[PDB]
């Protein structure tokens, strides 16, 4: 899925 709050540079979620 898209990241968002995580950021394009943030760690990835399933």
């Amino acid at each position, epitope marked *: 899925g898209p*990241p*968002g*709050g*995580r*950021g*394009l*540079t*943030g*760690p*990835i*979620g*399933p």
Partner: antibody
Amino acid sequence: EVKLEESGGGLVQPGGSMKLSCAASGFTFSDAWMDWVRQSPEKGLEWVAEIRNKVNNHATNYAESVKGRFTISRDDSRSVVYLQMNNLKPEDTGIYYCTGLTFDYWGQGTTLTVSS
Amino acid sequence: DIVLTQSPASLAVSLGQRATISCRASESVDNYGISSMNWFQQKAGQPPKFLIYAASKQGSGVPARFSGSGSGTDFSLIIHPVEEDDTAVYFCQQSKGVPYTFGGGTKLEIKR
């Protein structure tokens, strides 16, 4: 246009305290994961602390070198990140950048000097 | 701590030439079929600017001449054709494992 402004840097003596804060506009703050990074000549660029969004329980994480000395926190209503820094050491000297969306966005930085 | 070592420390590249800057991670940084590796440019007196994410993807408005590539251990940033504004320090940065870690930096000088 996205903007992050740090304040609350300056001079303070070892063991003392200082509260840095960070004003953020231009992105949906409540959703954003925020962080503090610091830069000094000796150590380079050091990620200091993270704080995740409301969906992720505002989870904090820190560099082991500042655990239980620094505390990161936020006000999703004010769109503001805070770094409470306690028992400050000479190695904590550096420029502190506040970043948004992990490290997508970066403020201009506020300088902290920890010297007697 | 997954430690990044960049090479070289600095180079000096003529205009319209290739500038290749490499990053070496002490453990793999791939997560969920995506390589967790980013690149930053720091121009003098300024904060680091985000350039590349997911090893090979492009930041918004980030010029075509910047592009990254790699997988697992070894990544690189490729600037070509180089221009006068590309004089900066370049960091690679890892985002799989906490702590999130920055390389020590690589200085690009532009030859004239």
